[PDB]
Swiss-Prot record:
Residues where Fe(3+) 2 binds: E54, E57, H76, H120, E124
Protein name: F-box/LRR-repeat protein 5
Annotated binding of Fe(3+) 1, by residue: H11, H53, E57, E124
One function term, GO molecular function aspect: 2 iron, 2 sulfur cluster binding
UniProt source species: Homo sapiens
PTM notes: Polybiquitinated upon iron and oxygen depletion, leading to its degradation by the proteasome. Ubiquitination is regulated by the hemerythrin-like region that acts as an oxygen and iron sensor. Undergoes constitutive ubiquitin-dependent degradation at the steady state by HERC2.
GO cellular component, one term: perinuclear region of cytoplasm
Domain of life of the organism encoding this protein: Eukaryota
Alphabetical keyword list: 2Fe-2S, Cytoplasm, Iron, Iron-sulfur, Leucine-rich repeat, Metal-binding, Nucleus, Repeat, Ubl conjugation, Ubl conjugation pathway
Protein's cellular compartments: Cytoplasm, Perinuclear region; Nucleus
Gene name per UniProt: FBXL5
Amino acid sequence: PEEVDVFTAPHWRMKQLVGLYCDKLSKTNFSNNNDFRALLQSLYATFKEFKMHEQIENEYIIGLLQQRSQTIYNVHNKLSEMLSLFEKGLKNVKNEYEQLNYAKQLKERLEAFTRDFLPHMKEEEEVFQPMLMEYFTYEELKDIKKKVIAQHC
């Protein structure tokens, strides 16, 4: 039921963001300083919204589900490292040799990030959403989703 689903719309926005940076990345001219900085500026804004996303889940969803089921063990950092990588590109890359070296690193890290992020969202939808249905009443889930949408939008 739509009104108790706490993941689908947030994740629709996160995957739209993934699609946009994958697009930007494949089209960026890493030899061009303006293109390079513009890309890193997008990614920084984007990964900041990813971080707001995980924090919202921690604060409004997971920390509650954890309290009631107590089947929590995997904590729900990578995002701060990605953001730190972007800051570096923005503050410490000063010519074309450094841009192109950095570019190879960025691409590898973004690829690895992207391959983990998508499954991580799938798992919340497939695992946590069902648990939420058992540990909370229907109106309780409706209330949680009201709060999660307010924080994301």
